[PDB]
Amino acid sequence: GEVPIGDPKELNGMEIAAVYLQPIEMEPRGIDLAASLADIHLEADIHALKNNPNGFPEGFWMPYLTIAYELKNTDTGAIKRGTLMPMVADDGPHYGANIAMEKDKKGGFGVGNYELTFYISNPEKQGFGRHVDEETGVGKWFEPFKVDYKFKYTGTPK
Amino acid sequence: GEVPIGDPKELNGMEIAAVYLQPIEMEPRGIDLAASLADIHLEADIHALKNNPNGFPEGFWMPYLTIAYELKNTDTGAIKRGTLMPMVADDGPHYGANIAMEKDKKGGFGVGNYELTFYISNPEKQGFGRHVDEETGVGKWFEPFKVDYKFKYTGTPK
Ligand SMILES: [Cu+2]
Ligand SMILES: [Cu+2]
Ligand SMILES: [Mn+2]
Ligand SMILES: [Mn+2]
């Protein structure tokens, strides 16, 4: 029951797609918003492309990325921010977070037209190294960037 | 060059193998022992097996693992410990560390018969989440475990 969010982007040797589905229960507790307090679960699917400049195989999950998001309702004008934390599900690893939409007590996060922005920084920010030697070395990481999406939130799918 | 260390184990839905190379110049700087001060680059190749109980596709590198090593020289008795940090090379991500062997003056880490032990803890120790709902949930993480290797160190590869 995954609803697609806009069109996927291909940049910095990665494919960056967005989806959302029913809220999910995550361990460890206390890091994420609880399932009952949320309406959706946002996910960032980031996998390596062909000939990734940082040495990642095609289709491999891009790990240790630092992802912040910004969800804007174009109609009501409401904006919220958070972070997508790394986790694994039955369809493998991803970056995600439970998000309150209708249940957001501030309001203006119900059914409507939206803009989603990711803010991604490379793995070195989290202590992930890379070889730079002649034989096995890879190229420089990307500078912090962002990708914009546009989608229509049709309501909670739970 | 790349010299293999012992047999690769199949434990806890993972293929765990060990190899060592020539000292690798790594970035960012400061994070690892310098290539000029080292004699080998110890490596731990850990990927998911078929039917992984924690949702990881077959072949995928297992991320966010805490790997501590204990390299002991059975002839001389000299022990040293450290941790293998995550990094990427042109053939993909792995856990590695530059190690001083002949260049370590504090012990007898020269050519001879060695024992290598990895002490691996699950991704949840570094704040890696997992879904536990019925629809998209995965199995419980493995408890901390050891894997043992026996090899003969022949010197710096060249
Ligand atoms: Cu998730
Ligand atoms: Cu390495
Ligand atoms: Mn998914
Ligand atoms: Mn290798």
Side-chain angles (χ1 to χ4, degrees), chain A residues 4 7 14 17 27 31-32 37-38 44 50 55 57 75 83 86 97-98 100 114 118 124 130 140 147-148 150 156:
Chain A
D7 306 333
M14 303 184 290
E27 281 194 38
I31 295 290
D32 198 29
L37 295 166
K50 292 165 154 59
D75 300 326
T83 56
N98 283 350
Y114 282 81
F118 293 143
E124 283 185 9
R130 74 192 178 85
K140 277 182 168 181
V147 287
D148 302 352
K150 283 183 175 59
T156 177

mmCIF file of all heavy atoms in Angstrom, chain A residues 4 7 14 17 27 31-32 37-38 44 50 55 57 75 83 86 97-98 100 114 118 124 130 140 147-148 150 156:
data_model
loop_
_atom_site.group_PDB
_atom_site.id
_atom_site.type_symbol
_atom_site.label_atom_id
_atom_site.label_comp_id
_atom_site.label_asym_id
_atom_site.label_seq_id
_atom_site.Cartn_x
_atom_site.Cartn_y
_atom_site.Cartn_z
ATOM 1 N N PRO A 4 2.994 6.678 -4.348
ATOM 2 C CA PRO A 4 4.172 7.386 -4.851
ATOM 3 C C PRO A 4 4.073 8.905 -4.696
ATOM 4 O O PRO A 4 2.990 9.474 -4.837
ATOM 5 C CB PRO A 4 4.211 6.993 -6.331
ATOM 6 C CG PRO A 4 2.810 6.698 -6.683
ATOM 7 C CD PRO A 4 2.159 6.153 -5.445
ATOM 8 N N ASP A 7 7.761 12.651 -9.033
ATOM 9 C CA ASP A 7 8.691 11.928 -9.897
ATOM 10 C C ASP A 7 10.032 11.756 -9.189
ATOM 11 O O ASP A 7 10.462 12.648 -8.456
ATOM 12 C CB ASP A 7 8.914 12.690 -11.208
ATOM 13 C CG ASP A 7 7.618 13.029 -11.926
ATOM 14 O OD1 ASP A 7 6.613 12.304 -11.745
ATOM 15 O OD2 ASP A 7 7.609 14.023 -12.680
ATOM 16 N N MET A 14 22.979 8.632 -7.618
ATOM 17 C CA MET A 14 21.919 8.020 -6.814
ATOM 18 C C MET A 14 20.566 8.227 -7.477
ATOM 19 O O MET A 14 20.368 9.189 -8.217
ATOM 20 C CB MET A 14 21.875 8.642 -5.414
ATOM 21 C CG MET A 14 23.172 8.552 -4.627
ATOM 22 S SD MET A 14 23.010 9.214 -2.950
ATOM 23 C CE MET A 14 22.838 10.962 -3.287
ATOM 24 N N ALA A 17 13.944 8.504 -4.757
ATOM 25 C CA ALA A 17 12.491 8.424 -4.891
ATOM 26 C C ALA A 17 11.825 8.610 -3.529
ATOM 27 O O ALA A 17 12.439 8.365 -2.489
ATOM 28 C CB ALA A 17 12.092 7.087 -5.497
ATOM 29 N N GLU A 27 11.162 -0.227 16.304
ATOM 30 C CA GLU A 27 12.106 -0.407 17.406
ATOM 31 C C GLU A 27 13.487 0.024 16.914
ATOM 32 O O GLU A 27 13.864 -0.312 15.795
ATOM 33 C CB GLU A 27 12.152 -1.865 17.868
ATOM 34 C CG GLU A 27 10.987 -2.280 18.762
ATOM 35 C CD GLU A 27 11.222 -3.606 19.475
ATOM 36 O OE1 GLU A 27 12.370 -3.872 19.896
ATOM 37 O OE2 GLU A 27 10.253 -4.378 19.625
ATOM 38 N N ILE A 31 12.598 7.065 19.426
ATOM 39 C CA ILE A 31 13.243 7.821 18.353
ATOM 40 C C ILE A 31 12.196 8.404 17.400
ATOM 41 O O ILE A 31 12.282 9.574 17.021
ATOM 42 C CB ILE A 31 14.242 6.948 17.552
ATOM 43 C CG1 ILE A 31 15.418 6.523 18.439
ATOM 44 C CG2 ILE A 31 14.767 7.706 16.327
ATOM 45 C CD1 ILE A 31 16.358 7.663 18.812
ATOM 46 N N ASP A 32 11.209 7.589 17.033
ATOM 47 C CA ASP A 32 10.203 7.965 16.035
ATOM 48 C C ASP A 32 8.857 8.316 16.681
ATOM 49 O O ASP A 32 8.602 7.980 17.842
ATOM 50 C CB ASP A 32 10.024 6.809 15.038
ATOM 51 C CG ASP A 32 9.350 7.237 13.739
ATOM 52 O OD1 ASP A 32 9.488 8.414 13.332
ATOM 53 O OD2 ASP A 32 8.685 6.382 13.115
ATOM 54 N N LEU A 37 -0.258 8.104 16.811
ATOM 55 C CA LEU A 37 -0.187 9.565 16.703
ATOM 56 C C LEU A 37 0.035 10.053 15.268
ATOM 57 O O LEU A 37 -0.034 11.255 15.010
ATOM 58 C CB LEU A 37 0.926 10.111 17.608
ATOM 59 C CG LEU A 37 0.712 9.916 19.112
ATOM 60 C CD1 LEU A 37 1.996 10.161 19.880
ATOM 61 C CD2 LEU A 37 -0.388 10.823 19.618
ATOM 62 N N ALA A 38 0.293 9.126 14.347
ATOM 63 C CA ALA A 38 0.616 9.459 12.957
ATOM 64 C C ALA A 38 -0.488 9.046 11.985
ATOM 65 O O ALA A 38 -1.389 8.279 12.329
ATOM 66 C CB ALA A 38 1.930 8.802 12.558
ATOM 67 N N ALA A 44 12.255 7.597 2.092
ATOM 68 C CA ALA A 44 13.183 8.006 1.042
ATOM 69 C C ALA A 44 13.958 6.778 0.561
ATOM 70 O O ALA A 44 14.768 6.212 1.304
ATOM 71 C CB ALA A 44 14.135 9.071 1.561
ATOM 72 N N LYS A 50 24.076 3.083 -12.006
ATOM 73 C CA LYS A 50 25.206 2.558 -12.762
ATOM 74 C C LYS A 50 26.405 3.499 -12.610
ATOM 75 O O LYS A 50 26.237 4.717 -12.539
ATOM 76 C CB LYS A 50 24.842 2.425 -14.244
ATOM 77 C CG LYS A 50 23.789 1.362 -14.560
ATOM 78 C CD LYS A 50 23.218 1.551 -15.970
ATOM 79 C CE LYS A 50 22.700 0.247 -16.567
ATOM 80 N NZ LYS A 50 21.637 -0.379 -15.746
ATOM 81 N N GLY A 55 31.812 4.515 -5.749
ATOM 82 C CA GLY A 55 32.131 3.090 -5.687
ATOM 83 C C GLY A 55 31.018 2.150 -5.260
ATOM 84 O O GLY A 55 31.251 0.954 -5.114
ATOM 85 N N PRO A 57 27.874 -0.282 -5.663
ATOM 86 C CA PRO A 57 27.264 -1.120 -6.702
ATOM 87 C C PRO A 57 25.856 -0.673 -7.110
ATOM 88 O O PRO A 57 25.146 -0.052 -6.315
ATOM 89 C CB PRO A 57 27.197 -2.506 -6.046
ATOM 90 C CG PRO A 57 28.233 -2.490 -5.003
ATOM 91 C CD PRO A 57 28.280 -1.086 -4.494
ATOM 92 N N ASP A 75 -1.809 24.770 -0.391
ATOM 93 C CA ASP A 75 -3.107 25.417 -0.188
ATOM 94 C C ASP A 75 -3.151 26.174 1.139
ATOM 95 O O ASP A 75 -3.283 27.400 1.154
ATOM 96 C CB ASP A 75 -4.245 24.386 -0.235
ATOM 97 C CG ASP A 75 -4.323 23.648 -1.565
ATOM 98 O OD1 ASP A 75 -4.026 24.264 -2.613
ATOM 99 O OD2 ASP A 75 -4.688 22.451 -1.561
ATOM 100 N N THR A 83 13.377 14.870 10.419
ATOM 101 C CA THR A 83 14.462 14.095 9.827
ATOM 102 C C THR A 83 13.994 12.678 9.519
ATOM 103 O O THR A 83 13.118 12.140 10.197
ATOM 104 C CB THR A 83 15.691 14.039 10.759
ATOM 105 O OG1 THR A 83 15.308 13.514 12.034
ATOM 106 C CG2 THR A 83 16.294 15.429 10.947
ATOM 107 N N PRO A 86 17.507 6.179 9.361
ATOM 108 C CA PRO A 86 17.706 4.895 8.695
ATOM 109 C C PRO A 86 17.063 3.729 9.449
ATOM 110 O O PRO A 86 17.154 3.659 10.674
ATOM 111 C CB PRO A 86 19.230 4.748 8.673
ATOM 112 C CG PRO A 86 19.711 5.564 9.802
ATOM 113 C CD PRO A 86 18.771 6.720 9.895
ATOM 114 N N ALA A 97 10.209 8.121 8.429
ATOM 115 C CA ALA A 97 9.691 8.729 9.650
ATOM 116 C C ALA A 97 8.167 8.753 9.627
ATOM 117 O O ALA A 97 7.566 9.080 8.601
ATOM 118 C CB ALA A 97 10.235 10.145 9.810
ATOM 119 N N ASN A 98 7.549 8.392 10.752
ATOM 120 C CA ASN A 98 6.115 8.588 10.940
ATOM 121 C C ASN A 98 5.839 10.083 11.023
ATOM 122 O O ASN A 98 6.604 10.827 11.640
ATOM 123 C CB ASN A 98 5.612 7.886 12.209
ATOM 124 C CG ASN A 98 5.459 6.379 12.036
ATOM 125 O OD1 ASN A 98 5.552 5.850 10.929
ATOM 126 N ND2 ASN A 98 5.216 5.684 13.139
ATOM 127 N N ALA A 100 2.567 13.038 11.458
ATOM 128 C CA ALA A 100 1.179 13.390 11.732
ATOM 129 C C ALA A 100 0.690 14.338 10.644
ATOM 130 O O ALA A 100 1.307 15.376 10.404
ATOM 131 C CB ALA A 100 1.059 14.046 13.095
ATOM 132 N N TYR A 114 0.651 19.234 -2.020
ATOM 133 C CA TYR A 114 1.861 19.357 -1.204
ATOM 134 C C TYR A 114 3.153 19.498 -2.005
ATOM 135 O O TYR A 114 3.228 19.105 -3.172
ATOM 136 C CB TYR A 114 1.998 18.141 -0.285
ATOM 137 C CG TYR A 114 1.111 18.200 0.926
ATOM 138 C CD1 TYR A 114 -0.229 17.850 0.840
ATOM 139 C CD2 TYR A 114 1.610 18.607 2.161
ATOM 140 C CE1 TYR A 114 -1.056 17.902 1.949
ATOM 141 C CE2 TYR A 114 0.793 18.663 3.281
ATOM 142 C CZ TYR A 114 -0.540 18.310 3.165
ATOM 143 O OH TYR A 114 -1.364 18.360 4.258
ATOM 144 N N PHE A 118 13.658 17.185 0.265
ATOM 145 C CA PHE A 118 14.677 16.487 1.051
ATOM 146 C C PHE A 118 15.938 17.331 1.099
ATOM 147 O O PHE A 118 16.245 18.038 0.146
ATOM 148 C CB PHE A 118 15.028 15.126 0.438
ATOM 149 C CG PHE A 118 13.916 14.107 0.490
ATOM 150 C CD1 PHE A 118 13.735 13.221 -0.562
ATOM 151 C CD2 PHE A 118 13.087 13.995 1.602
ATOM 152 C CE1 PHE A 118 12.732 12.266 -0.524
ATOM 153 C CE2 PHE A 118 12.077 13.041 1.643
ATOM 154 C CZ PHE A 118 11.902 12.175 0.579
ATOM 155 N N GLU A 124 30.287 11.219 4.877
ATOM 156 C CA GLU A 124 31.441 11.650 5.689
ATOM 157 C C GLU A 124 31.032 12.446 6.926
ATOM 158 O O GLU A 124 31.758 12.470 7.919
ATOM 159 C CB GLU A 124 32.442 12.470 4.868
ATOM 160 C CG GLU A 124 33.318 11.634 3.947
ATOM 161 C CD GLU A 124 34.386 12.450 3.237
ATOM 162 O OE1 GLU A 124 34.564 13.641 3.577
ATOM 163 O OE2 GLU A 124 35.055 11.895 2.339
ATOM 164 N N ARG A 130 36.370 6.830 2.789
ATOM 165 C CA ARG A 130 36.502 6.365 1.413
ATOM 166 C C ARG A 130 37.972 6.189 1.049
ATOM 167 O O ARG A 130 38.830 6.941 1.514
ATOM 168 C CB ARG A 130 35.821 7.339 0.440
ATOM 169 C CG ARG A 130 36.574 8.641 0.211
ATOM 170 C CD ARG A 130 35.730 9.665 -0.524
ATOM 171 N NE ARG A 130 36.452 10.930 -0.688
ATOM 172 C CZ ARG A 130 37.311 11.204 -1.670
ATOM 173 N NH1 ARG A 130 37.584 10.308 -2.617
ATOM 174 N NH2 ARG A 130 37.907 12.391 -1.707
ATOM 175 N N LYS A 140 35.407 12.194 -5.076
ATOM 176 C CA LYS A 140 34.841 13.031 -4.016
ATOM 177 C C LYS A 140 33.344 12.807 -3.831
ATOM 178 O O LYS A 140 32.616 12.497 -4.781
ATOM 179 C CB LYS A 140 35.063 14.518 -4.311
ATOM 180 C CG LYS A 140 36.425 15.069 -3.913
ATOM 181 C CD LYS A 140 36.501 16.566 -4.213
ATOM 182 C CE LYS A 140 37.716 17.220 -3.576
ATOM 183 N NZ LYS A 140 37.764 18.680 -3.862
ATOM 184 N N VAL A 147 16.288 17.973 -3.209
ATOM 185 C CA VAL A 147 15.410 17.557 -4.301
ATOM 186 C C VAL A 147 13.965 17.906 -3.946
ATOM 187 O O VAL A 147 13.522 17.664 -2.824
ATOM 188 C CB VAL A 147 15.535 16.041 -4.612
ATOM 189 C CG1 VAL A 147 16.857 15.748 -5.306
ATOM 190 C CG2 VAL A 147 15.395 15.203 -3.344
ATOM 191 N N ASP A 148 13.246 18.494 -4.900
ATOM 192 C CA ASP A 148 11.861 18.914 -4.694
ATOM 193 C C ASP A 148 10.903 17.899 -5.309
ATOM 194 O O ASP A 148 11.169 17.363 -6.387
ATOM 195 C CB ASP A 148 11.616 20.286 -5.329
ATOM 196 C CG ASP A 148 12.547 21.366 -4.788
ATOM 197 O OD1 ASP A 148 13.288 21.105 -3.817
ATOM 198 O OD2 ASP A 148 12.533 22.486 -5.340
ATOM 199 N N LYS A 150 6.424 17.112 -5.843
ATOM 200 C CA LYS A 150 5.053 17.605 -5.755
ATOM 201 C C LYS A 150 4.105 16.411 -5.788
ATOM 202 O O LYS A 150 4.219 15.548 -6.661
ATOM 203 C CB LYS A 150 4.735 18.563 -6.907
ATOM 204 C CG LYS A 150 5.315 19.963 -6.744
ATOM 205 C CD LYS A 150 4.889 20.878 -7.895
ATOM 206 C CE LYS A 150 5.351 22.316 -7.682
ATOM 207 N NZ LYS A 150 6.834 22.423 -7.563
ATOM 208 N N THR A 156 -5.128 9.319 4.870
ATOM 209 C CA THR A 156 -4.431 8.213 5.539
ATOM 210 C C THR A 156 -4.879 6.849 4.989
ATOM 211 O O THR A 156 -6.082 6.610 4.851
ATOM 212 C CB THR A 156 -4.635 8.247 7.082
ATOM 213 O OG1 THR A 156 -3.998 7.110 7.681
ATOM 214 C CG2 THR A 156 -6.120 8.257 7.452
#
